[PDB]
Amino acid sequence: VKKEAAEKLLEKVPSDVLEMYKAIGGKIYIVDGDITKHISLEALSEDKKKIKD
């Protein structure tokens, strides 16, 4: 009789395609602190306000 030999049908593995999608990449955006300056006097005042006759 003649031997099969068996060279196989399956080629490589999914693992390369699996690794392709497995890509995670970079996520999220900068927020919160930004720059922050601010300056004006809407908080408190100062002006002569007494009483007399």
Binding site: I35, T36, K37, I39
Partner: protein, 51 residues
């Protein structure tokens, strides 16, 4: 002082007015601010709040 960082022939990087970190209270004649034994001061800011 109002100073200016300049590259090259006349390529001005920036013009910076001295902030409150860079204030000198006294500059008597024939003197340095700061004194010669001490190290010179650092200017690294652009904004009035130096942020």
């Amino acid at each position: 002082p109002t100073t200016s960082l300049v590259l090259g022939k006349n390529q001005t990087l920036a013009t910076i007015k001295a902030k409150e970190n860079q204030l000198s209270q006294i500059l008597a004649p024939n003197n340095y601010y700061p004194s010669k034994n001490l190290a010179p001061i650092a200017l690294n800011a652009q904004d009035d709040f130096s942020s």
